[PDB]
Design an enzyme around this catalytic site. Structure first.
Site, PDB file in Angstrom:
ATOM      1  N   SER A  63       0.782  -1.235   0.000  1.00 33.51           N
ATOM      2  CA  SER A  63       0.000   0.000   0.000  1.00 33.51           C
ATOM      3  C   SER A  63       0.820   1.296   0.000  1.00 33.51           C
ATOM      4  O   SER A  63       0.213   2.376  -0.066  1.00 33.51           O
ATOM      5  CB  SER A  63      -0.947  -0.037   1.170  1.00 33.51           C
ATOM      6  OG  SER A  63      -1.975  -0.950   0.871  1.00 33.51           O
ATOM      7  N   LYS A  66      -0.139   3.558  -2.768  1.00 37.01           N
ATOM      8  CA  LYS A  66      -1.166   4.601  -2.705  1.00 37.01           C
ATOM      9  C   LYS A  66      -0.581   6.002  -2.732  1.00 37.01           C
ATOM     10  O   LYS A  66      -1.311   6.941  -3.106  1.00 37.01           O
ATOM     11  CB  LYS A  66      -2.024   4.419  -1.454  1.00 37.01           C
ATOM     12  CG  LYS A  66      -2.875   3.147  -1.524  1.00 37.01           C
ATOM     13  CD  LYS A  66      -3.621   2.894  -0.239  1.00 37.01           C
ATOM     14  CE  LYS A  66      -4.447   1.616  -0.305  1.00 37.01           C
ATOM     15  NZ  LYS A  66      -3.631   0.422  -0.275  1.00 37.01           N
ATOM     16  N   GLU A 271      -0.391   9.918   4.741  1.00 37.53           N
ATOM     17  CA  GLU A 271      -0.999  10.261   6.025  1.00 37.53           C
ATOM     18  C   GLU A 271      -0.040  11.155   6.799  1.00 37.53           C
ATOM     19  O   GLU A 271       1.179  11.029   6.672  1.00 37.53           O
ATOM     20  CB  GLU A 271      -1.311   8.989   6.821  1.00 37.53           C
ATOM     21  CG  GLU A 271      -2.327   8.117   6.095  1.00 37.53           C
ATOM     22  CD  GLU A 271      -2.456   6.734   6.681  1.00 37.53           C
ATOM     23  OE1 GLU A 271      -2.037   6.500   7.844  1.00 37.53           O
ATOM     24  OE2 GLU A 271      -3.015   5.867   5.973  1.00 37.53           O
ATOM     25  N   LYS A 314       3.698   6.492   5.205  1.00 36.68           N
ATOM     26  CA  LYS A 314       2.806   5.439   4.728  1.00 36.68           C
ATOM     27  C   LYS A 314       3.464   4.084   4.969  1.00 36.68           C
ATOM     28  O   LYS A 314       4.647   3.887   4.629  1.00 36.68           O
ATOM     29  CB  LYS A 314       2.513   5.608   3.234  1.00 36.68           C
ATOM     30  CG  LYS A 314       1.431   4.649   2.694  1.00 36.68           C
ATOM     31  CD  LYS A 314       0.032   4.947   3.304  1.00 36.68           C
ATOM     32  CE  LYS A 314      -1.014   3.972   2.790  1.00 36.68           C
ATOM     33  NZ  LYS A 314      -0.997   2.672   3.561  1.00 36.68           N
ATOM     34  N   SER A 317       2.356  -3.438   2.803  1.00 35.88           N
ATOM     35  CA  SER A 317       2.781  -4.830   2.885  1.00 35.88           C
ATOM     36  C   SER A 317       2.169  -5.611   1.744  1.00 35.88           C
ATOM     37  O   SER A 317       1.121  -5.251   1.202  1.00 35.88           O
ATOM     38  CB  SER A 317       2.280  -5.505   4.168  1.00 35.88           C
ATOM     39  OG  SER A 317       2.688  -4.754   5.278  1.00 35.88           O
TER      40      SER A 317
END
Length: 360
Positions: A63, A66, A271, A314, A317
């Protein structure tokens, strides 16, 4: 300022016990310190065939993919091709169910659409089945009520965001992000002449690679090297060297704050938390018991522009890999940790924090 040897001592003191304790076969780390990347590699990309990790080894990002999605979306916003306020139905008119009426691209991009599942079901393997899945999904709450992390929301955002360009997601990512940033060792699909560099992941002591699935590239399917990931962190931390105007602006937009979820702020893929901060906030926040929970969301509208006093990060996995990237623009400090075994999120974050705390 620290010497290379002093930085190496700090990194090795953390990574050496980490790899032994977690049974990680191979790792690559980059530290960005006072403007400069420092690279480190250890171990094996392929145990049985004795292939070492090198600065060219490709790891599955999971991820962390993203963050590429968010920047590509930001670039589309900057190009005037999409607005996050647009309804999803502007881009997929066949989603005719009432539950889609108020869902905007904003919501898909930020996990606030109402409760899509963590992954698209395994048996959804074609475009017809994908449409049927989304058409018949029922939300748990209204748009914006809660953030619930998923691959199926931001994955769809990526597919829709590239529609005005007329390119596939992979084509648009390559032309609009990877090529301008000179990321020549970052791939959605690893070509045959690069397979020699594609590490095996390890799960329960067996070599594994991720399996394809619907909307994989958009949410979890990117592979990259430590050099490219350091360059990616550098560009996201400070894009003043990026001459493509919409890409520079799109990078900035992925670090705007779109939602507040306690002390975390949701960007596009990235984030963020305010800096300075307490280590326990990010370490404990990374545990699946928090990171995967449905939590009330507070909209930041219009999105707050990026601030330098932020910890931007971020996790990601796959079955056989674990990655973590983090940076603090105010300090010009960042880290990339790539590993070919998945290991617990709080362990990743604590190790990154321990290294960066010594480099203040």
């Amino acid at each position: 300022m620290k010497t290379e040897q002093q930085i190496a001592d700090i990194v090795n003191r953390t990574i050496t016990p980490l790899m032994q304790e977690q049974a990680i076969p191979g790792m690559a780390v980059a530290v960005i310190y006072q403007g400069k990347p420092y690279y480190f590699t250890w171990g094996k990309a392929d145990i049985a065939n004795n292939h070492p990790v090198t600065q060219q080894t490709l790891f599955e990002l999971g991820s962390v993919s993203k963050t590429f999605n968010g920047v590509l979306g930001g670039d589309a916003i900057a190009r005037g091709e999409i607005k996050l306020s647009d309804p999803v139905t502007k881009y997929w008119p066949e989603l005719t169910g009432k539950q889609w009426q108020g869902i905007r691209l904003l919501h898909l991009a930020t996990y606030t659409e109402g409760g899509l599942p963590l992954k698209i079901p395994d048996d959804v393997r074609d475009k017809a089945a994908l449409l049927h899945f989304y058409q018949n999904w029922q939300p748990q709450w209204t748009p914006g009520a809660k953030r619930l992390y998923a691959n199926s929301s931001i994955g769809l955002f990526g597919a829709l965001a590239v529609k005005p360009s007329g390119m596939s997601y992979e084509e648009a990512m390559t032309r609009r992000v990877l090529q301008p940033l000179k990321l020549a060792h970052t791939w959605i699909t690893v070509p045959q002449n690069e397979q020699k560099d594609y590490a095996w992941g390890y799960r329960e002591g067996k070599p594994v690679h991720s399996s394809p699935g619907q909307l994989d590239a958009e949410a979890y399917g990117v592979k990259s090297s430590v050099i490219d990931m350091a360059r990616w962190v550098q560009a996201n931390m400070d894009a003043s060297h990026v001459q493509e105007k919409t890409l520079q602006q799109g990078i900035a937009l992925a670090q705007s704050r779109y939602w507040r979820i306690g002390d975390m702020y949701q960007g596009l893929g990235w984030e963020m938390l305010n800096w300075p901060l307490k280590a326990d906030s990010i370490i404990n926040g990374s545990d699946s018991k928090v990171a995967l929970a449905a939590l009330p969301a507070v909209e930041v509208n219009p999105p707050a522009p990026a601030v330098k006093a932020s910890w931007v990060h971020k996790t990601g996995s796959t079955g056989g890999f674990g990655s973590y990237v983090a940076f603090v623009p105010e300090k010009n400090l960042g880290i990339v940790m790539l590993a070919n075994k998945s290991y617990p999120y709080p362990v990743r974050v604590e190790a990154a924090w321990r290294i960066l705390e010594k480099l203040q």
